[PDB]
Amino acid sequence: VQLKESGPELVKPGASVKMSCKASGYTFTSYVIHWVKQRPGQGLEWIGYINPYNDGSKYNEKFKGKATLTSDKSSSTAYMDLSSLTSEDSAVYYCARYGVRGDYYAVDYWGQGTSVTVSSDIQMTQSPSSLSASVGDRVTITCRASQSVSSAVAWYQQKPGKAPKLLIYSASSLYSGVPSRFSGSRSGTDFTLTISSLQPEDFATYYCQQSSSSLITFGQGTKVEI
Amino acid sequence: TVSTPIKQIFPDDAFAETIKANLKKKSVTDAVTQNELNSIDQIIANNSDIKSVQGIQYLPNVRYLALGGNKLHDISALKELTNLTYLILTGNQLQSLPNGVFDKLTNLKELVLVENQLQSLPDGVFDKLTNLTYLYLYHNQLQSLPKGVFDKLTNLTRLDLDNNQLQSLPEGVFDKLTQLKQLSLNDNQLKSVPDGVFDRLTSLTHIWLLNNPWDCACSDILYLSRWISQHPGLVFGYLNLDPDSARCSGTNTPVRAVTEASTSPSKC
Amino acid sequence: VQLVESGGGLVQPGGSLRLSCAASGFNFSSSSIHWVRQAPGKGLEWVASISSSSGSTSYADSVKGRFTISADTSKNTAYLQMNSLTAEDTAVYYCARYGHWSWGRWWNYWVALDYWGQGTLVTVSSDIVMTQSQKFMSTSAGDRVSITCKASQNVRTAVAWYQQKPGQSPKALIYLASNRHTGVPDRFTGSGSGTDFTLTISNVQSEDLADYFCLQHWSYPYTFGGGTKLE
């Protein structure tokens, strides 16, 4: 008895993968075949189950727009088609049975596993994640691009529940209308937002954005608290 | 003498509307004494889109409550309706039964829980409904069953478990019925029934086993095969007597055609 | 000067949705229009872009082939068509003008999204939790270890344990709270019911160093534990 999964894949983002699981040693059509995802680094995640008799299928609601589960009772195979791929789908995938015997419920046997790798960037790192400096203080927020970018950075402010307004463009220039106390500066690959004084309306989140090469990327955000 | 308008007893507008329909009333803020509440023996609110039956606690005479194709979450108001005789809860999305919601309804004769997203039954829900004749549990998503879940319904004559996801029945789950004349198990996920599960249903005339993934390669199926062979005039399908409706899985050959030498216990 | 979005709301997984962004107050035919989405929880993610004149389109890999940006210069509106949507698309979608360098190439290098739309909410909808209170263990042969795994809700005796050593598929150690799946030594025993489950291992041996996790199959979705790797 054993489940045999298709061979490894490597696909570009946005494209398709369908993998197979060939049951052997029991009566394939009378026992359900779950599917489990496992990303290098974190725990397992359950995808769906499709029982090769009807065959109907529950999906985990995180996957319901991606995973499609099919099976052919003739060739004792269950299939899983994952589209369209992104790079978060880079993982090992498994199939395993759900066997019962009146009072014996388990998953029994897992397939050897199908590895999927997906790829063909700029990461803006802000410091700190959240600060807490008072009215009047000199706040300095630093944001460091992974790869070398020109003076291409911008700085936005986002009060809770409203669209971001823009503060600094091209790394040092004050945008129109923006107050005097705001300022930008560049030292190679780290970019510094500084507010000289601090007025009570500054207490909101601050994003940096790099566009030297579109794919456009933002920071994780710095939160300024009262 | 408490002149109490209907919409306070029953917060649900649609539900209060069935009350206004039940008493022959003109508006919906009219006053209603307890006396006229106790004129309500039956509440057919089948197919009328009711969210909460909060307030049906104070209808002491509902002998006939059929609430179908509704949006019920909370039937906890139904456990004080001792005089409930027929309960029909269909089309409602209730995922679970409270432990002990049916404990009090000792006058239940027929219980139709149908088309809910039931995945399990509580360990003893039916335990007090000893006068039960007709139990209809069909189109639920049940997978396993509790042990002796039916051990108290000694007067049962019709049991409908069809169209669930029953993967296996517990040992002797049917041992204490002895009055059942109709049992349905079609459209479920059974590979095999327990050794001698039907051996004491000495009043049984109709049984449905079709549309199950019966596993005629495992040796546990032998019992079902030798039973279909003994009682073919007992097995039904859609048209009439079809004792060949209990098909194997993947071969589609009749179960009653499975011979001992054609299986192996090493598989299951 | 303003940008008014529309078309958000409720969409079933796999479904589609078209967002619109009505522009006025600027030369719209010489500006780029960008869509940036924000999860309820995380930062701003740039999704798609377009130059209202060159028709040029670019997308983030996370929507490639599912999303289609466009614009109508005569009606000053840009639309983001979003097909085959997943739950992790649920977010507020913002629309923002670039203006400047666009209307040549470089139309999407170096933006400053000065003006933004008010945003619009997209929700893609049509759960039990197993916590392994220790990610790392430590022990030596003739061992002592017990691995705990506690559910967020009441899984009624329906929990299983899995031994996974590297480069392998998980072994199945214990099913239904307490049963030693066939072939598993007497050395492994599983304990508990309800919210609270344990896997105890005794003389631990060199072949027992692997990563153990738990799985509840009571309710849906089936959910696993974090994993516990042994020293």
Next chain:
Amino acid sequence: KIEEGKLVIWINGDKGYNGLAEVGKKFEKDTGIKVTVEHPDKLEEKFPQVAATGDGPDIIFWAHDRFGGYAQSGLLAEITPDKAFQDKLYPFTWDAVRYNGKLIAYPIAVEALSLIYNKDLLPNPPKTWEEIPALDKELKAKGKSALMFNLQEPYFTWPLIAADGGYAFKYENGKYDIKDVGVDNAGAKAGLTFLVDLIKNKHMNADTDYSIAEAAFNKGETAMTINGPWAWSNIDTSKVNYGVTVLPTFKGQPSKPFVGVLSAGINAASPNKELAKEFLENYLLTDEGLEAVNKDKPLGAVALKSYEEELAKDPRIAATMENAQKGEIMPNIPQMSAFWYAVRTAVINAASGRQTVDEALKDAQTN
């Protein structure tokens, strides 16, 4: 013609030719290939004429706008850098050297016209063009001037032309629309009209060229000039304490210069192609390489990821890029050749009194 074993390079006379030959002899001392850097007059026009007969240089340096006309007649060799040397340059700059799906040149640096002003005389430069005829009279009590810059080349007068909504060709639906030319719109008509007024009110002279515009700011005779980063070296020497800042706005809109990238293309007819790609890829587009050029005459914002970071501190590059970010980049379509010829004739005819503004631009649109 050109022999094989020798590279003949052409680069315009205002760039840092002397420093490029320095890199050429670096190439010599360890490959043995002689390199000759020459700076012929009207380089950009002699090349299509000599290349189609067979010969000319191996490598030509110019802005990227004329390389389209070149590649369209097949005078340039398609270049094939591997995707790992492509990563040594900003993924920005490789668009300006891509004519018809193929790569036809190497990007060296990004040029942009900035405002250069005498800090010792005009400490606060004008935010707008409107205030220069008034600033002029205030500097005619000294005998100074207010502003002077090349009027011979439309490259320099265009930031004021394209200010209020002027343009070369409309980039609509994947293509530059050749028959949609914006040299008559209300903006160009009003941009050149304001340029004309400055001449007949004698705040500039229609005869000014490059050789008296820079040759007046380096002696402090004029307060402001409009030039690119290549003029900095000559100014640096004269020890005129100057600054480089953003151009004046014209009727609210900012001055929108046309941006070019200095690009190196390879003659299709050269027998020395691989030698020519060794020089560019291994020696010129390096740190030690561009630094040699940049020290002769600065290049602006270099396209090499590496050496750009080292010049970041420079407040003069920032003004260059801050001013490039206003206004778009030069189309490279084969019609740019006839575009510039049409504009320097309409500017000259209107700076001189021959036709007025409406009459000078209506000519230029008839292609």
